[PDB]
Structures are given as structure tokens and as C-alpha cells.
Design a binder for these strands. Sequence first.
RNA 1: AUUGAAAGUUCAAAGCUUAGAUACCCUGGAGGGAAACCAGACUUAACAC
Length: 284
Amino acid sequence: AIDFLVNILELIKEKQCNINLFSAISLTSIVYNNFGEFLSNNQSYSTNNPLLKYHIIILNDKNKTKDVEEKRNIFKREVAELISRNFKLDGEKVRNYFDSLKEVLKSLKYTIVDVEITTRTRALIGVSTSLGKLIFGSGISFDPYMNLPYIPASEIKGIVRSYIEGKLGEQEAEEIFGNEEREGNVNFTDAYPTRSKDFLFVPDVITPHYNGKKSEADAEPRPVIHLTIAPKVTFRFLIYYKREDVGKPICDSMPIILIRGLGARSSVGYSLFELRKIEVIKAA
RNA sequence: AUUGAAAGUUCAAAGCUUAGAUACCCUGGAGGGAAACCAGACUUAACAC
């Protein structure tokens, strides 16, 4: 119902790790995309909904539609700040998940290699995925049932494989990861954030001026507020296999490829990671 | 005016009976939601002199 929508911001502020962030952002996107309408005596006349203060601020009393536009921009920034502040990491379910999965893989007689990597700068993984896409035009790869951002197993595998190509040749890359005729020997799980020092998300901006622009006459900043993954967030994922003589390349490839980027726009130093730990458990 | 003349190969009769398109068979293997992008531009007006 509509009261769900008028209260979604309060619910974000008061649950902070226990609401579905995916659906929460999807719902508050309706508020963001009907902002001018949710501010015509249709705030349910509450007292905690952040929609109140946008009746108290007078940004432009001359023209009301401009006023609603500026209020909407302020509200976009405020939604970004809200999500970054309130939605924090509780990575105990993640440690439980990875420990149980490790036991499962041990029972299946796999050699497990559990890798912990910490982000060093603000990371962008899944920038074209849907999360905040309907508010920010930019997304984060988000698992809506772990209720966490994550790094897909396919990206980790692809980055490791492109490095192993660039180093040991396409033939060894196919001897490890397979081709259209043989299946790979190395399995990757998704990477989930297990611990953090502070905020899990933070706001950021990109402001292209001269992107696909003829001349300075075409120049104009178009700022893009969006969410990123805060620094010092540790992610964890597993690497399991059976054939022993495939652990050597993996071992070598992990420390290097994380220094270079792992998500989006690493060319300007965004998605850089440190190797926090690597443990190897040989099936005995 | 012939080793001739005359004489229906005819009658009755079900290609039926029993019989499973079934058995074995992973939509799988390979594949980075990435690439590009300045949170920036600029002071103006009024009167006094």
C-alpha cells in the first residue's frame, strides 16, 4: 500500500540491516520519482518521515517547479547518505555461510582455498546492475537474499583467467579453466563482505564535463550521485577444485590481480583490493 | 459327313491369433556488467567618490 511507501524511509532508518535493501531502494525509488506528488499534502502528515523537512525548506519561492527540482536533488543526496549511514554490515551470517559451505566442500573431497580480500579505495562492482538504478542511474552488484553487496564468481574467475592468459599463455589458461570442449577444473564462489571498519556503502559522484562533447560550447557538468562500496570492507570467497596441480597458478595469481582493479573504473583507481589472507586446505 | 456330341474347376472357407516404441541418456561446456567521463564555471549589482 501507499503507507508502506511513505514509511519506507523510516523503516530504513530503524532496521538498518534487517530490511531487504533491494526492495527498500526499489520502493523509495517510487517516492523519488513522484517526489513532487508525495509533497502535496500526501506525506501522510507523519512526524518522522524525512519528507517533512522538504516542506520546511524554501529553496525558490518564485517558481514552484524549480523548487521541487532542487528539493528532489537534495532528497537524492539525502537518500544516498541515509543508505550509506544506516545500512551497515553484519557479517556473521556470512561467516556462518562460508564455514558451512567449507564443511560441505570438505565432505565432497574438494581442496578448498578460502581468500579474504579487503578493499583499499571505494569500489564499484556491478555498476550496471539494478540497485539504486532507478534513483542513481548506477548500481551495485547486490544479492537480495544475503541482503549484501557481492562480487560475482564469474568476475573473479574472469579476472584470474585473463591474468593467467597474459602470463602463461592461452593454452595453459584453457588447461586450467577449460574451453568449449573441456570443462574447467577450478570453481569459484561469489565474494561477500564478512567484516568492515565502518560504513559498508558510501556516496560518491562523477561529473563528466567533456564526455562526447564537440567543444567548450558543449561543456556542462552533469553530476551523478551514486553509491560505492566503502574502503576497508573485507570480502571473502572460496576456490575449490580436485586436481592438485591447479593450485599453483591460483596461489600465484591472487596477490597480483587484486592490486590492479577488480570492479568498475579501475583506470582511475576505484576498485583496488588488498589480499588479506589465503588459506589452503588439502583434501587428506 | 471330324477317335465325334454333350459337360461352368464349381461348392464351403475372416490373413487371423499372441505381442507395451520400449530400454540407457544432467541443456551442459567456455565467457570479468564492464568501457568512457574534472563536482565544476563565474562574480555581479547598488549608491558614495
